[PDB]
């Protein structure tokens, strides 16, 4: 459910960051732009900056610099059929979700009901209760987290 | 016979004109104006009381200019060009800058 | 550089604009998330990339789209390059 690769990540710096705190700024930018974001159907759960290889030349574009940082990336991803468990969360009568460590599960409308919040999918679930689900369909991630249409196991 | 021509062309690559030195100075000056750290020796609080163009020229002359230029499939620093041509163009530029009250 | 700066929009009017690398539409921003409505409706996950162009260019391209012409942009991903020391060359004559 994961793998490890070596590759370059591209980042953009402003001139005022080309100071003695260059490594800190590079690390902050890399984490901000790649840490928990889903790109091309995969997430990078861990990023290691080599610190032992030659850094390539930076490319000047208008008033900014573009740098390729070498790194070892631990890619993680999910597919259909996997079983996960997470905390239920109800915000309104239509939006009910399951929050996990790094996964969000969305429940279809024709699965249960919301009343008070509480969920009734054949069993009573309190807002914040822990429930098990199985991923069914994929979508686009939001706020650095996977999104999948899933049904309660 | 191809290798001889290639060597001649590689040597020809090292000559310098106004366009290249002007571009290098422009890039370095833009970066310095927008707030990069100068790379001059004996850096101290007295360095910030000087003229920025003086700092750029000093960086070029002492071999710490960070700009790299791609010309004929190669990557050259300012010091890889012919030395006499660099002196020639820099002398002219400094004269006209003095006429303009910049230097 | 001078002509480039003259013909561009003012540096004080910059803003972040994203374009979809698949169909060329300007990406919308819904609830703070950049999204391509056309491609999302087709169940696709294309790359969104930042561009720095003039407003008139966007108007011209959108009108061309309205006339039925699709304009797609690609981007350069040249592999990283490294500097190497070079041997010295003199270039003076033998006198």
């Amino acid at each position: 459910s994961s793998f490890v690769t070596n590759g370059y990540l591209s980042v953009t710096l402003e001139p005022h960051e080309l100071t003695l705190d260059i490594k800190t700024n590079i690390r902050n930018a890399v984490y901000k732009t790649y840490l928990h974001r889903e790109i091309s159907g995969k997430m990078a759960k861990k990023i290691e900056i080599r610190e032992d290889v030659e850094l390539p030349l930076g490319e000047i574009v208008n008033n900014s610099v573009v740098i390729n940082v070498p790194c070892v990336i631990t890619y993680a991803y999910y597919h259909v059929g996997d079983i996960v468990r997470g905390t239920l969360n109800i915000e309104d009568e239509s939006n009910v979700t399951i929050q996990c460590g790094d996964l969000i599960c969305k429940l279809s409308r024709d699965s249960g009901t919301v009343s008070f919040c509480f969920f009734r999918n054949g069993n009573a679930y309190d807002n914040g209760s822990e429930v098990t689900a199985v991923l069914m369909e994929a979508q686009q991630g939001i706020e650095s987290s996977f999104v999948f249409l899933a049904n309660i196991v | 016979i191809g290798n001889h021509i290639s060597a001649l062309k590689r040597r020809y690559t090292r000559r310098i004109s106004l366009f290249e030195i002007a571009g290098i100075i422009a890039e370095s000056y833009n970066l310095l104006q927008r707030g990069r750290l100068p790379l001059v020796s004996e850096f101290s609080d007295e360095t910030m009381k000087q003229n920025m163009l003086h700092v750029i020229i000093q960086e070029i002359e002492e071999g710490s200019c960070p700009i790299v230029i791609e010309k004929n499939g190669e990557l050259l620093s300012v010091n890889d060009f012919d030395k006499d041509g660099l002196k020639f163009h820099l002398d002219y530029i400094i004269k006209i800058w003095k006429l303009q009250k910049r230097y | 550089n001078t002509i480039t700066e003259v013909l561009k929009d003012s540096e004080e009017d910059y803003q972040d604009v994203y374009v979809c690398e698949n169909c060329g539409d300007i990406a919308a921003q819904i609830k703070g998330i950049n999204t391509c409505l056309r491609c999302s409706k087709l169940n696709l996950s294309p790359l969104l990339t930042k561009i720095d162009t003039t407003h008139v260019s966007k108007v011209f391209l959108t009108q061309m789209n309205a006339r039925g012409v699709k304009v797609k942009l690609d981007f350069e991903r040249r592999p990283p390059s490294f500097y190497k020391p070079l041997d010295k060359v003199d270039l003076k004559p033998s006198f």
């Binding site: 080309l18 260059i22 930076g58 610099v65 | 002007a22 970066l31 700009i67 790299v68 | 162009t53 390059s81």
Partner: peptide, 29 residues
């Protein structure tokens, strides 16, 4: 180049410019 706000391949724009960060990263506070 004018259409997309790029630098024309003329004069100073005939070359491509990079910055070598090697010396900056070899300095320690």
């Amino acid at each position: 180049c004018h259409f997309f706000s790029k630098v024309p391949n003329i004069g100073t724009g005939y070359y491509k410019y990079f910055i070598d960060l090697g010396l900056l990263m070899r300095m320690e506070r």
